[PDB]
Design a protein around this nucleic acid. Structure first.
Lengths: 151, 100, 205, 30, 262
RNA sequence: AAACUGCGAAUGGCUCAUUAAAUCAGUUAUGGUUCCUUUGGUCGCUCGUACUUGGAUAACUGUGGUAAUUCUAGAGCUAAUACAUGCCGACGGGCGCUGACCCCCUUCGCGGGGGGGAUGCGUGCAUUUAUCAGUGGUGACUCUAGAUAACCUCGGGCCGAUCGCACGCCGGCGGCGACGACCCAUUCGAACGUCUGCCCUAUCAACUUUCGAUGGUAGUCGCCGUGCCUACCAUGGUGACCACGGGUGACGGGGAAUCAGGGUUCGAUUCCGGAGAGGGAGCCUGAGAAACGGCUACCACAUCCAAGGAAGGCAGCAGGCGCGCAAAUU
């Protein structure tokens, strides 16, 4: 329950969890030691990462990805898939003949780790480039900042 | 011993093929009836089965057990063979020599 | 002509690509060679770079490690009992990665009594042949019986494993890829994973 | 060749070990 | 293509070889080797286009096949062998020794050195790894690997090789105040003192270098070669001292060389 | 000479049909891969006939078949850096796991503590899995190195049965090369990704999802990352900021003509990148090809024939026919 919802046993692959022990620790405090790492670009790992119990192999903090490439940022529009959200990135494109600009946008399906709970729509995520996680997913949510009005 | 031959159109006999008529096989290196031009080449060539019928031009034959009389074109005369052994261990095998 | 290209797929919007180049060799796939259980039969595939792959088509034996004890032994493979992806890889008894498999226990039993001097998986009839009596009840030195009894303070297995040692068949999970290296290796299921797959096999049957 | 370079490195490793080991305890009491 | 390419068109050759347009369709196309083909001199270009010892490629074949050219102490019969930055080309028959060092305009100069100097060279360490029973390794900028270096040698330092043994004699560390040559980009061939290094994580670092006359320029970190310690170079420097003149003062020097000579 | 062996034939040359976020350009990344060669490292690190191993097969000799091909069959020889096989040596040991025994100290003694050890067992690098501790590095590793328990594919992994030159020093010990070789690094790449960028069309407004569409979990396959494929789930994904569909007398750039300034039109074409060798498809060999001056089919054409069969691919250089307003020397 609460993790094992799939047909296969979910576990962090780096942590061995069947270390035998004597009854003074076998009965006293039962804690699976969590694997987490520190991604390197000044981003600090959230609290829910290092103490949570979720298992996500695509999480940037407790899974097997590395963050290298482009740091970008968008705004959450759709939260309707399993562990992956859709952001929108707005920019101005310079047309040279008219010396002017036009509002364009591009969508990005991006992977959202379960360590970012309380993510609304309309708020600004920071995304980092990883290896291709899916057919259309190449980025990963690294930092969430709320919208302007949510006190 | 029956040792192969050609049919009435010149196609040779392959050993494994168990037909009377000709077939088409895709031949590679290490096969008979085909010599490849490049490395890895394979070609589809006609070839005849190994069962002897009355539709050949030559049936090659190899005498294995000599009889009592002498066919005058075959069995009487001797050849000097060419080219004795060249590897050193086939020299000593010929004359039953020692290491010394 | 099995291919793994992306260009035969739709785009993210749903429009179809037109192919601009035809099938290249580096995008090839090979047939999905299904390992079975039988006497050892392994074919060799020549792959990109001139390297080498091993298609196990039939395996019967591979080494599995007892995780708690750190004891790795080569062990006969009995049967497939649970596959987490498809159920038709069980009735056909196909060995792939992460499948749950029944292995022999006697290389683990003979290590256990040689290292801990305790019976494991023995019946209550207690018929003991004179082979293992001189390793279970040997004469030994005082310094050595001290070590052998100091090991006996922690030589305790879970109850979920000893009922398997009663039947001579542990449960294991294959950790390597038999179509890619020709080997079926893995580990013995213990603990939370063990009771997870036990209730999965229980609910499936 | 292998035995000579392994010795010459270990002789050189002692200097780079003990020069750092001098300034190991130098900062602690100060 | 279906595989690796073997030709080089003459227009797509590197600019600093100073080939011209009309003598052919092809350029010499360097062999694979210790230096990159956008960063090297093939031995055929050094021996007939720079030194004028030959007039054809056939004569370069004849000169090299008499085993007369040693590059870094070893005889090379390959006429497209890629010589590169700070290689010692030593012709024993004429008694000449050369080192390939960039000019102030980013081309390899015909720099002659004494046979005392021709027994060493400087290399830039690009990679350190520990491999297979704890043996530390170097990888220099010309594909040398060295087992058991000094443990103070770190990546981006500059070591000194003895060309016969192949072993390190001493090294310079990467620090502010040491002397550089730029080996890449716009600032190629310039020489000065490190004053600064700003570290951008996940990307390229930028090193600020100050010229001997007070000019200042930046490069990337990979385009930096530490020549000497402090101000003293450990090698001899070419005609210009790594001080790039502007076009106005270069014109003034070129005109002052005509009103005095003649 | 021939022939076997090795390498090259995947470059170059030609053309612009396809192709509209595709190709391509600038920018990034491989911490997600492979890499003949070059260059450097490594190559008594492994504790278990060699002063040299075995069987063939061409060229050659000889007998032939077919109307016909760079078609080949049978017989007699003989080689290897082809194909196979396989040892000494360094080699004395070390290092871990067992551990009969022996000895010492304390204890009245039991008991407790400490040394040596016969016996076996395993052992290096590469592979596959599991566990433990945390020399060097990164912005960041589930990195590198280490330690332990094993495994190690008959369609087997490395650990040299190879060749030349100069000749030798005290029967041994040899100096230069050449060809090799697992692995590591480098070079030349390649391949998959990141971000931004393209002409006309709404008389194309909704598309995608049955037959993967968007995502999750486990696998399979792949050189590896990934719906690439499969199984089970979720119902997603794109769009008036123009999706989807169609057209283009569209290969993309560097560039070209014109030009007060702004612009408009062209770029098949010698440099770079892509694609394709009549149309599709499938492969072998190899480091590299879905190769076409390689092979196997089908479709369309088309050649030789003794009617049984055999052979083909100029969008290489010339040249011819055609087509046309339109373009050169067998």
């Amino acid at each position: 329950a609460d993790i094992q919802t799939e047909r296969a046993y979910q576990k962090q692959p780096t942590i061995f969890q069947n270390k035998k022990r004597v009854l003074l620790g076998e009965t006293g405090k039962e804690k699976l030691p969590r694997y987490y790492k520190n991604i390197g670009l000044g981003f600090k790992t959230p609290k829910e990462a290092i103490e949570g119990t979720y298992i996500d192999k695509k999480c940037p903090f407790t899974g097997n990805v590395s963050i290298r490439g482009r740091i970008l940022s968008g705004v959450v529009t759709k939260m309707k898939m399993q562990r992956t959200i859709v952001i929108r990135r707005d920019y101005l494109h310079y047309i040279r003949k008219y010396n002017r600009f036009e509002k364009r946008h591009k969508n990005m399906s991006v992977h959202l780790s379960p360590c970012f709970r309380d993510v609304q729509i309309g708020d600004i995520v920071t995304v980092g480039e990883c290896r291709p996680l899916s057919k259309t997913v190449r980025f990963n949510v690294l930092k969430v900042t709320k919208a302007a009005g949510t006190k | 011993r029956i040792s192969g031959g050609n049919d009435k159109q010149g196609f040779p006999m392959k050993q494994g093929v168990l037909t009377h008529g000709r077939v088409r096989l895709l031949l590679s290196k290490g096969h008979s009836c085909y010599r490849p031009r490049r490395t890895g080449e394979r070609k589809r060539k006609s070839v005849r089965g190994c069962i002897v019928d009355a539709n050949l031009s030559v049936l090659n034959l190899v005498i294995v057990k000599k009889g009592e009389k002498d066919i005058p074109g075959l069995t009487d005369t001797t050849v000097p063979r060419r080219l004795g052994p060249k590897r050193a261990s086939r020299i000593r095998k010929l004359f039953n020599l020692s290491k010394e | 002509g099995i291919s793994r290209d992306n260009w035969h797929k739709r785009r993210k919007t749903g429009g179809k690509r037109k192919p601009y180049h035809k099938k290249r060799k580096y995008e090839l796939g090979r047939p999905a060679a299904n390992t079975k259980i039988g006497p050892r039969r392994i074919h060799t595939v020549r792959v990109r770079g001139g390297n080498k792959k091993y298609r196990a088509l039939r395996l019967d034996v591979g080494n599995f490690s007892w995780g708690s004890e750190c004891c790795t032994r080569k062990t006969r493979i009995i049967d497939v009992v649970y596959n987490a992806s498809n159920n038709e890889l069980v009735r056909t008894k196909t060995l792939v990665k992460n499948c749950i498999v029944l292995i022999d226990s006697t290389p683990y039993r003979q290590w256990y009594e040689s290292h801990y001097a305790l019976p494991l998986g023995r019946k209550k009839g207690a018929k003991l042949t004179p082979e293992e009596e001189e390793i279970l009840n040997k004469k030994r030195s005082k310094k050595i019986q001290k070590k052998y009894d100091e090991r006996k303070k922690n030589a305790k297995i879970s109850s979920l494993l000893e009922e398997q040692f009663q039947q001579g068949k542990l449960l294991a999970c294959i950790a390597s890829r038999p179509g890619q290296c020709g080997r079926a290796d893995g580990y013995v299921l213990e603990g939370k994973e063990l009771e997870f797959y036990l209730r999965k096999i229980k609910a499936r049957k | 060749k292998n035995k000579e370079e392994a010795a010459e490195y270990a002789k050189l490793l002692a200097k780079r070990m003990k020069e750092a080991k001098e300034k190991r305890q130098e900062q602690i009491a100060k | 293509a279906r595989g690796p390419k073997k030709h080089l068109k003459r227009v797509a050759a590197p600019k600093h070889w100073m080939l011209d347009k009309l003598t052919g369709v092809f350029a010499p196309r360097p062999s694979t080797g210790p230096h990159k083909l956008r960063e090297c001199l093939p031995l055929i270009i050094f021996l007939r286009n720079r030194l004028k010892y030959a007039l054809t490629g056939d004569e370069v074949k004849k000169i090299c096949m008499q085993r007369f050219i040693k590059i870094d102490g070893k005889v090379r019969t390959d006429i497209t062998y890629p010589a590169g930055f700070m290689d010692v080309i030593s012709i024993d028959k004429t008694g000449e020794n050369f080192r390939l060092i960039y000019d102030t305009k980013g081309r390899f100069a015909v720099h002659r050195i004494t046979p005392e100097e021709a027994k060493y060279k400087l290399c830039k360490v690009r990679k350190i790894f520990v491999g297979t029973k704890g043996i530390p390794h170097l990888v220099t900028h010309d594909a040398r690997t060295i087992r058991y270096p000094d443990p103070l040698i770190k990546v981006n330092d500059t070591i000194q090789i003895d060309l016969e043994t192949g072993k390190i004699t001493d090294f310079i560390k990467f620090d502010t105040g040491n002397l550089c040559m730029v080996t890449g980009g716009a600032n190629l061939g310039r020489i000065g003192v490190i004053t600064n290094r700003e570290r951008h994580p996940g990307s390229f670092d930028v090193v600020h270098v100050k010229d001997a006359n007070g000019n200042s320029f930046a490069t990337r970190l990979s385009n930096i070669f530490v020549i000497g310690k402090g101000n003293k170079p450990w090698i001899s420097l070419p005609r210009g001292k790594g001080i790039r003149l502007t076009i106005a003062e270069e014109r003034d020097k070129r005109l002052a060389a005509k009103q005095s000579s003649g």
